Amino acid sequence: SHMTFVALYDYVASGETDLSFKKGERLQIVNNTEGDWWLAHSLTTGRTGYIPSNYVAPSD
């Protein structure tokens, strides 16, 4: 259930459904059913949206 990942790079969202996040931000992964785009929730900003799965790595 707790699935914490850390952002490896900045990402500015290009649309409505993706999530913008800063390098070093910690995110709860909500839905990793797809291998390319994961639904994530920022523990910092409280925003929720899709992120590129290759921009994050497992974290505490």
Swiss-Prot record:
Q: Give tissue specificity per the record.
A: Expressed to high levels, and with a high degree of kinase activity, in certain fully differentiated cells such as neurons, platelets and macrophages. Isoform 1 is widely expressed. Isoform 2 is expressed only in the muscle.
What protein does this entry describe?
Proto-oncogene tyrosine-protein kinase Src
Reported modifications of this chain: The phosphorylated form is termed pp60c-src.
Protein origin, superkingdom: Eukaryota
**What does the similarity note say?**
Belongs to the protein kinase superfamily. Tyr protein kinase family. SRC subfamily.
Domain SH3 spans what residues? 4-60
- SUBUNIT field: Forms a complex with polyoma virus middle T antigen. Interacts with AFAP-110. Interacts with GJA1 and PXN.
Q: Which gene encodes it?
A: SRC
Function, as annotated, reads: Non-receptor protein tyrosine kinase which is activated following engagement of many different classes of cellular receptors including immune response receptors, integrins and other adhesion receptors, receptor protein tyrosine kinases, G protein-coupled receptors as well as cytokine receptors. Participates in signaling pathways that control a diverse spectrum of biological activities including gene transcription, immune response, cell adhesion, cell cycle progression, apoptosis, migration, and transformation.
Cellular localization per UniProt: Cell membrane; Mitochondrion inner membrane; Endosome membrane; Nucleus
TM region positions: none
